[PDB]
Structure 1
Amino acid sequence: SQIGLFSKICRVTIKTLHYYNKIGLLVPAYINPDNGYRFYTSDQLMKFHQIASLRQLGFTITEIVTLTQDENSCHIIERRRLEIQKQIRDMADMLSRINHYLQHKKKERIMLYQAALKEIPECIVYSKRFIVPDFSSYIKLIPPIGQEVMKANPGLTLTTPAYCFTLYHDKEYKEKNMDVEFCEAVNDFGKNEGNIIFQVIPAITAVTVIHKGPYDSLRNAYIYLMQWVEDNGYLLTNSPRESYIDGIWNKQDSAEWMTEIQFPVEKV
């Protein structure tokens, strides 16, 4: 049986048989020496059936080679099974994210706020945890901290890139009684003089949105991130962070400012 007849018996392409002969998965029963013509046999079909049976389970080709040439490989079927359930979990996550994306696109004609899930590494910060009378007043006590720390900690170099964020320890929304905590990432440890203390913040997987524009429409992004959290079955594991990437310090226009809100979450 030539390769054209075998490809019609097997209902597979000829190039598939060429590839399987090249890699050594399915070798023809007899190859004509002068022409090169591959000839196949029923005993090759009995093996192509096994190849197809394994390949329909999503096994990679090299896994199929290992399974059919070397027996007692029950660890490879377990690896493929665990990977299949992991991919199923990831696929359910992706499905929820794309359903949410369509309900939002069908909600507002322009999408102002995309949501991205990113992992934040561990870091060394100096932090001051304090009760703030108003969000407008929160901005006032930060530049005092910025000069005082550089005067009190000489040669202290902030990391690059600059991770300067806020920990919202409030489990509910309020305007005037915010128990907030100002953090700023630094390269190495230091002295803990004053109300400013040093600490490490654990690496977290967090869903983040970057808000461009003034600080009054941030409630939109928070409700959106909360909406994302309720829609996609995540649970808030830690306090939300507020990372100030660009602001009045690089650019004078207040509507081009940008900050990224991070929601530490786990899928539950």
Structure 2
Amino acid sequence: NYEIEVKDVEPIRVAFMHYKGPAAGASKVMPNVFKSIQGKANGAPFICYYVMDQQTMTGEMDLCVPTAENPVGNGIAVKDMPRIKAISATHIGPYETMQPVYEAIESYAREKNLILQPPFREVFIKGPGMILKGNPNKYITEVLFPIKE
């Protein structure tokens, strides 16, 4: 049970950097976004996935931290992330266990005659800290997959 529902997700101003490579490796790079705004986030950090492969878990994505601040850091800039009408699925546990969440979103979309519209997002509601890793078994990750409206 991934608590699947359709959400009206409002626009978000983010500090971000572009990242190309394995999604798992993004966690080493995300701290640079927080450091650029002196940790002054006004929302949960997330990845916006533009090009991704489910099997290789590698592609092109933006590492995003919601903020009102002007970032100062190499390769950090600001994007106004657009409003999305999105399928929301919530995953509890480590990031390695998340392919089934996407299968559940695809099934839900197919059954409700909704058309998936990348890019999609993983929102780290409860995840690793900059220093403290915490318990990956209790991580809360919200997948937001936009649909055609």
The interval holding the TM-score normalised by the smaller chain is 0.7 to 0.9
Amino acid at match of 2:140: M
TM-score with structure 1 setting the length? 0.50
**The residue matched to 2:138 in structure 1 has which SS?**
coil
Partner of 1:157: 40
Aligned to 1:217: 97
Q: 2:27 maps to what in 1? A: 139
User: What is the CA distance between 1:172 and its match in structure 2?
Assistant: 4.3
Q: Residue 259 of structure 1 corresponds to which residue in structure 2?
A: 141
- Mean Cα displacement is larger for which, 171-180 or 121-130? 171-180
Per the alignment, do residues 246 and 136 of structure 1 end up closer, same or farther by CA in structure 2, a change over 3 Å counting?
A: same
**Superposition CA RMSD, Å:** 2.3
Matched, 1:169 2:58: no
CA contact (8 A) 1:251 1:257 kept: no
Take 2:53 and 2:109, find their aligned partners in 1: how far apart are those partners?
Answer: 15
Q: Residue in 2 aligned with 1:115?
A: 4
Helix, strand or coil: the match of 1:139? helix
Alignment counterpart, residue 18 of structure 2, candidates 129, 147, 150: 129
* Residue of structure 2 equivalent to 1:12: none
Q: Which runs of 5+ in 1 are unaligned?
A: 1-111
Q: In 2, distance between residues paired with 1:239 and 1:131?
A: 15
Q: Larger % of helix: which?
A: 1
Distance 1:145 1:191, change over 3 A: closer
Q: Does 1:185 align with 2:72?
A: no
Shift of residue 142, structure 1, vs aligned partner: 1.7
Q: CA deviation at 1:127?
A: 1.4
Residue by residue over 1:14-45, the C-alpha shift from the partner in whole angstroms, topping out at 9 and shown as x without a partner, is xxxxxxxxxxxxxxxxxxxxxxxxxxxxxxxx
Runs of 4+ residues over 4 Å off in structure 1: none
Q: Distance in 2 between matches of 1:208 and 1:256?
A: 18
> Offset of 1:143 from its aligned partner?
2.0
Could you say if the C-alpha distance between residues 247 and 171 of structure 1 is closer, same or farther in structure 2, counting changes exceeding 3 Å? closer
- Number of residue pairs the alignment of both structures matches: 147
* Aligned partner letter, 2:5: A
State the structure with bigger RCO (CA 8 A, min sep 6), 1 or 2: 2
Distance 1:200 1:175, change over 3 A: same
Taking a change above 3 Å as real, the CA distance of residues 180 and 251 of structure 1, as seen in their structure-2 partners, is: closer
Matched-pair contact (CA < 8 Å) for 2:91–2:98? yes
Determine which structure has the larger strand proportion and give its number. 2
Tell me if the contact between 1:126 and 1:199 (Cα under 8 Å) persists in the aligned partners.
Answer: yes
State the Cα distance separating 1:150 from its structure 2 match.
3.4
Aligned to 1:163, the other structure's residue is in SS state: coil
Structure with max Cα Rg: 1
**Cα shift at 1:228:** 1.3
For each residue in 1:63-121, what CA deviation from the matched residue of structure 2 results, as whole angstroms up to 9, or x when unmatched? xxxxxxxxxxxxxxxxxxxxxxxxxxxxxxxxxxxxxxxxxxxxxxxxx3221111111
